[PDB]
Amino acid sequence: ALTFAKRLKADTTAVHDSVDNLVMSVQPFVSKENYIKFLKLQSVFHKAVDHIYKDAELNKAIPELEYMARYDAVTQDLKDLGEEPYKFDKELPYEAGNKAIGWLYCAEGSNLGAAFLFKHAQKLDYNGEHGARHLAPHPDGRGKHWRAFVEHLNALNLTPEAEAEAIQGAREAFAFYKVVLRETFGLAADAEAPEGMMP
Ligand code: HEM
């Protein structure tokens, strides 16, 4: 990998796939009840990167970053389902520095992949205007919007030392996501999708 954005993906594809498999494994779209659990998980994760999107310094290296946050859309999705705002039990990670960049990558990247989730959400009468607001595509199209975001990432001009932290940060973001998922769907700690399952 000769670029920052590509190295991130490279060092996190395995953990990313474990996330994809685990989410699918818990049947988020099998019922309104389960979907609600999926929204709560999403809520927590996006609440946890809300301070990163609105990060002064980061908004200098990346334009309109703050406006890319999906936390509100998720809370509104919860509203549409008859649920009041959800709040995590434990303490929410509040990452900063280069490791927080990894978290940003994780959250922003998840948009790129919400297409699949968006499609299955729409099978439950949940679309970008109701219930699946947080999954709808960026007005400019997931592809474009993302490739652009990528330029900004590769633009930070982080040193190998910096990337190392950001990448470790991206792994930790993916790890947290699974911790919340397990708790939200009532699984044991360290629970994973059936071994051998492919995304
Ligand atoms: C079962 C649910 C999920 C599915 C089916 C899924 C699927 C995918 C797919 C197909 C892409 C393709 C993007 C493209 O090349 O156009 C992608 C990208 C991405 N996903 Fe997932 N994903 C899921 C959940 C998540 C979650 C919950 C996170 C993180 C908390 C995550 C983070 C990312 C990241 C960071 C990227 C960007 C990868 C890159 O560097 O191009 N995904 N995902």
CSV table of C-alpha atoms and ligand atoms in Angstrom, one decimal:
chain,number,residue,atom,x,y,z
A,1,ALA,CA,0.0,0.0,0.0
A,2,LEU,CA,1.6,3.3,-1.2
A,3,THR,CA,-1.1,5.6,0.3
A,4,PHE,CA,-2.4,6.3,3.8
A,5,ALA,CA,-6.1,5.5,3.0
A,6,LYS,CA,-5.1,2.2,1.4
A,7,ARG,CA,-2.9,1.2,4.3
A,8,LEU,CA,-5.8,1.8,6.7
A,9,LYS,CA,-8.1,-0.5,4.7
A,10,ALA,CA,-5.3,-3.1,4.4
A,11,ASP,CA,-4.6,-3.3,8.1
A,12,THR,CA,-8.3,-3.3,9.0
A,13,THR,CA,-10.0,-5.5,6.4
A,14,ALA,CA,-9.9,-8.6,8.5
A,15,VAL,CA,-11.4,-6.9,11.6
A,16,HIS,CA,-13.8,-5.1,9.3
A,17,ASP,CA,-15.0,-8.4,7.9
A,18,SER,CA,-15.5,-9.7,11.4
A,19,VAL,CA,-17.7,-6.7,12.1
A,20,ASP,CA,-19.7,-7.2,8.9
A,21,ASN,CA,-20.2,-10.9,9.8
A,22,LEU,CA,-21.1,-10.2,13.4
A,23,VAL,CA,-23.7,-7.6,12.5
A,24,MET,CA,-25.3,-9.8,10.0
A,25,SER,CA,-25.1,-12.7,12.4
A,26,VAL,CA,-27.4,-11.0,14.9
A,27,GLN,CA,-30.2,-10.4,12.4
A,28,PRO,CA,-30.6,-6.6,12.6
A,29,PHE,CA,-33.5,-6.7,10.0
A,30,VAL,CA,-35.4,-9.7,11.3
A,31,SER,CA,-37.8,-7.6,13.2
A,32,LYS,CA,-38.6,-4.0,14.4
A,33,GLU,CA,-37.4,-5.1,17.8
A,34,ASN,CA,-34.0,-6.2,16.5
A,35,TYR,CA,-33.7,-3.2,14.2
A,36,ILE,CA,-34.2,-1.0,17.2
A,37,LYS,CA,-31.3,-2.8,18.9
A,38,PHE,CA,-29.3,-2.1,15.7
A,39,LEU,CA,-30.2,1.6,16.0
A,40,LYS,CA,-29.1,1.7,19.6
A,41,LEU,CA,-25.7,0.2,18.7
A,42,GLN,CA,-25.3,2.7,15.8
A,43,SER,CA,-26.4,5.5,18.2
A,44,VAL,CA,-23.6,4.7,20.6
A,45,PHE,CA,-20.9,4.4,18.0
A,46,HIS,CA,-21.8,7.7,16.3
A,47,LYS,CA,-22.2,9.5,19.5
A,48,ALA,CA,-18.6,8.4,20.3
A,49,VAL,CA,-17.2,10.0,17.1
A,50,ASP,CA,-19.4,13.2,17.4
A,51,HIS,CA,-16.6,15.1,19.1
A,52,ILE,CA,-14.2,14.0,16.4
A,53,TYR,CA,-16.3,15.3,13.5
A,54,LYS,CA,-16.7,18.7,15.2
A,55,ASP,CA,-12.9,18.8,16.0
A,56,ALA,CA,-11.6,22.4,15.4
A,57,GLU,CA,-8.2,21.3,14.3
A,58,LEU,CA,-9.5,18.6,12.0
A,59,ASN,CA,-12.0,21.0,10.5
A,60,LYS,CA,-9.0,22.9,9.3
A,61,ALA,CA,-7.5,20.0,7.4
A,62,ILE,CA,-10.9,18.8,6.2
A,63,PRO,CA,-13.7,21.2,5.1
A,64,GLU,CA,-17.3,20.8,6.4
A,65,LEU,CA,-16.1,17.8,8.4
A,66,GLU,CA,-18.4,18.6,11.2
A,67,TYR,CA,-21.4,18.4,8.9
A,68,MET,CA,-20.6,14.8,8.0
A,69,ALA,CA,-21.8,13.5,11.4
A,70,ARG,CA,-24.6,10.9,11.4
A,71,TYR,CA,-25.5,11.0,15.1
A,72,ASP,CA,-28.6,13.2,14.7
A,73,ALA,CA,-29.9,11.1,11.8
A,74,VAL,CA,-29.7,8.0,14.0
A,75,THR,CA,-31.4,9.7,16.9
A,76,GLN,CA,-34.1,10.7,14.5
A,77,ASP,CA,-34.3,7.2,13.2
A,78,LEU,CA,-34.9,6.1,16.8
A,79,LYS,CA,-37.5,8.8,17.0
A,80,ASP,CA,-39.3,7.5,13.9
A,81,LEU,CA,-39.4,4.1,15.6
A,82,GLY,CA,-41.0,5.4,18.8
A,83,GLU,CA,-37.8,5.4,20.7
A,84,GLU,CA,-36.4,8.2,22.9
A,85,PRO,CA,-32.7,9.1,22.5
A,86,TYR,CA,-30.5,6.2,23.5
A,87,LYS,CA,-27.6,6.6,26.0
A,88,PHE,CA,-24.8,4.1,26.6
A,89,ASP,CA,-24.4,2.5,30.0
A,90,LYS,CA,-20.7,2.7,30.5
A,91,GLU,CA,-18.4,5.6,29.7
A,92,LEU,CA,-18.1,6.5,26.0
A,93,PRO,CA,-14.7,6.6,24.5
A,94,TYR,CA,-13.6,10.1,23.8
A,95,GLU,CA,-10.6,9.7,21.5
A,96,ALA,CA,-8.3,12.5,20.4
A,97,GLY,CA,-5.0,13.0,18.4
A,98,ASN,CA,-3.9,10.7,15.6
A,99,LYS,CA,-5.8,7.7,17.1
A,100,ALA,CA,-9.0,9.8,16.7
A,101,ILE,CA,-8.2,10.0,13.0
A,102,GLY,CA,-8.5,6.3,12.8
A,103,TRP,CA,-11.9,6.5,14.5
A,104,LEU,CA,-12.9,9.1,11.9
A,105,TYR,CA,-11.8,6.8,9.2
A,106,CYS,CA,-13.9,4.0,10.7
A,107,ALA,CA,-17.1,6.0,11.0
A,108,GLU,CA,-16.8,7.8,7.6
A,109,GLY,CA,-15.9,4.6,5.9
A,110,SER,CA,-18.9,2.9,7.4
A,111,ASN,CA,-21.0,5.3,5.2
A,112,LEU,CA,-19.4,3.9,2.1
A,113,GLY,CA,-20.7,0.5,3.2
A,114,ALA,CA,-24.1,1.4,4.5
A,115,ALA,CA,-25.5,0.7,1.0
A,116,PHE,CA,-26.1,-3.0,1.8
A,117,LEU,CA,-27.6,-2.1,5.1
A,118,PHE,CA,-29.7,0.7,3.5
A,119,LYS,CA,-31.1,-1.9,1.0
A,120,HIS,CA,-32.1,-4.3,3.7
A,121,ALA,CA,-33.5,-1.5,5.8
A,122,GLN,CA,-35.7,-0.5,3.0
A,123,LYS,CA,-37.1,-4.0,3.1
A,124,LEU,CA,-38.7,-3.0,6.4
A,125,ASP,CA,-40.3,0.1,5.0
A,126,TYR,CA,-37.3,2.1,6.4
A,127,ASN,CA,-35.8,4.5,3.9
A,128,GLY,CA,-33.7,7.7,4.0
A,129,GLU,CA,-36.9,9.7,5.0
A,130,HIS,CA,-38.0,7.3,7.7
A,131,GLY,CA,-36.2,4.9,10.0
A,132,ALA,CA,-33.0,4.6,7.9
A,133,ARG,CA,-32.0,8.2,7.7
A,134,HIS,CA,-28.5,7.5,9.0
A,135,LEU,CA,-28.0,4.9,6.2
A,136,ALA,CA,-29.1,7.0,3.2
A,137,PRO,CA,-26.3,7.8,0.7
A,138,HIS,CA,-24.5,11.2,0.7
A,139,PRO,CA,-26.4,13.6,-1.7
A,140,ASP,CA,-23.3,13.6,-3.8
A,141,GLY,CA,-23.2,9.8,-3.9
A,142,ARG,CA,-21.2,7.5,-1.6
A,143,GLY,CA,-18.5,7.0,-4.1
A,144,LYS,CA,-17.6,10.6,-4.9
A,145,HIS,CA,-18.0,12.0,-1.4
A,146,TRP,CA,-15.8,9.2,-0.1
A,147,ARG,CA,-13.0,9.4,-2.7
A,148,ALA,CA,-12.9,13.1,-1.8
A,149,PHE,CA,-12.8,12.4,1.9
A,150,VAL,CA,-9.9,10.1,1.1
A,151,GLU,CA,-7.8,12.8,-0.5
A,152,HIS,CA,-8.2,14.8,2.7
A,153,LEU,CA,-7.0,11.8,4.7
A,154,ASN,CA,-3.9,11.3,2.5
A,155,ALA,CA,-3.6,15.0,2.8
A,156,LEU,CA,-3.0,15.2,6.5
A,157,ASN,CA,0.5,14.1,5.6
A,158,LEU,CA,0.9,11.9,8.7
A,159,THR,CA,4.3,10.4,9.5
A,160,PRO,CA,4.7,6.6,9.6
A,161,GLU,CA,4.7,7.2,13.3
A,162,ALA,CA,1.4,9.1,13.0
A,163,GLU,CA,-0.3,6.6,10.7
A,164,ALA,CA,0.7,3.8,13.1
A,165,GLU,CA,-1.4,5.5,15.8
A,166,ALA,CA,-4.2,6.3,13.4
A,167,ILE,CA,-4.3,2.7,12.2
A,168,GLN,CA,-4.2,1.4,15.8
A,169,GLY,CA,-6.9,3.9,16.4
A,170,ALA,CA,-9.0,2.5,13.6
A,171,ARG,CA,-8.6,-1.0,15.0
A,172,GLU,CA,-9.8,0.2,18.4
A,173,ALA,CA,-12.8,1.8,16.8
A,174,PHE,CA,-13.7,-1.4,15.1
A,175,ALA,CA,-13.2,-3.2,18.5
A,176,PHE,CA,-15.4,-0.8,20.4
A,177,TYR,CA,-18.1,-1.3,17.8
A,178,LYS,CA,-18.1,-5.0,18.5
A,179,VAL,CA,-18.1,-4.4,22.3
A,180,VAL,CA,-21.2,-2.3,22.0
A,181,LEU,CA,-22.9,-4.7,19.6
A,182,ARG,CA,-22.4,-7.6,22.0
A,183,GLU,CA,-23.9,-5.7,24.9
A,184,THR,CA,-26.7,-4.4,22.8
A,185,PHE,CA,-27.7,-7.8,21.4
A,186,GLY,CA,-27.0,-9.6,24.6
A,187,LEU,CA,-24.0,-11.7,23.5
A,188,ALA,CA,-21.1,-12.8,25.6
A,189,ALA,CA,-17.9,-10.7,25.6
A,190,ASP,CA,-15.6,-11.6,22.7
A,191,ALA,CA,-18.5,-13.3,20.9
A,192,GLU,CA,-18.0,-13.5,17.1
A,193,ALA,CA,-19.8,-14.6,13.9
A,194,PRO,CA,-19.7,-18.4,13.2
A,195,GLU,CA,-16.1,-19.2,12.3
A,196,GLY,CA,-15.6,-19.5,8.5
A,197,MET,CA,-18.4,-17.2,7.5
A,198,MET,CA,-17.5,-14.9,4.6
A,199,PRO,CA,-18.8,-11.3,4.2
B,1,HEM,C1,-23.0,-5.9,8.0
B,1,HEM,C2,-22.7,-4.5,7.8
B,1,HEM,C3,-21.7,-4.0,6.9
B,1,HEM,C4,-21.6,-4.3,5.6
B,1,HEM,C5,-22.4,-5.3,4.8
B,1,HEM,C6,-20.4,-3.5,5.1
B,1,HEM,C7,-20.0,-3.6,3.8
B,1,HEM,C8,-19.0,-2.8,3.3
B,1,HEM,C9,-18.8,-2.7,1.9
B,1,HEM,C10,-19.4,-3.5,0.8
B,1,HEM,C11,-17.9,-1.7,1.7
B,1,HEM,C12,-17.6,-1.2,0.3
B,1,HEM,C13,-17.2,0.2,0.0
B,1,HEM,C14,-16.8,0.4,-1.4
B,1,HEM,O1,-15.7,-0.1,-1.8
B,1,HEM,O2,-17.5,1.0,-2.2
B,1,HEM,C15,-17.5,-1.2,3.1
B,1,HEM,C16,-16.6,-0.2,3.4
B,1,HEM,C17,-16.3,0.3,4.7
B,1,HEM,N1,-16.9,-0.2,5.9
B,1,HEM,FE1,-18.2,-1.7,6.1
B,1,HEM,N2,-19.8,-2.8,6.1
B,1,HEM,C18,-20.7,-3.0,7.3
B,1,HEM,C19,-20.6,-2.4,8.5
B,1,HEM,C20,-19.6,-1.5,8.8
B,1,HEM,C21,-19.5,-0.9,10.1
B,1,HEM,C22,-20.5,-1.0,11.2
B,1,HEM,C23,-18.3,-0.2,10.1
B,1,HEM,C24,-17.6,0.4,11.2
B,1,HEM,C25,-18.1,0.6,12.5
B,1,HEM,C26,-17.7,-0.3,8.8
B,1,HEM,C27,-16.6,0.4,8.3
B,1,HEM,C28,-16.2,0.5,6.9
B,1,HEM,C29,-15.1,1.3,6.4
B,1,HEM,C30,-14.1,2.0,7.3
B,1,HEM,C31,-15.2,1.2,5.1
B,1,HEM,C32,-14.2,1.9,4.2
B,1,HEM,C33,-13.3,0.9,3.5
B,1,HEM,C34,-12.3,1.6,2.5
B,1,HEM,O3,-11.3,2.1,3.0
B,1,HEM,O4,-12.7,1.7,1.3
B,1,HEM,N3,-18.5,-1.1,8.0
B,1,HEM,N4,-18.2,-1.9,4.1
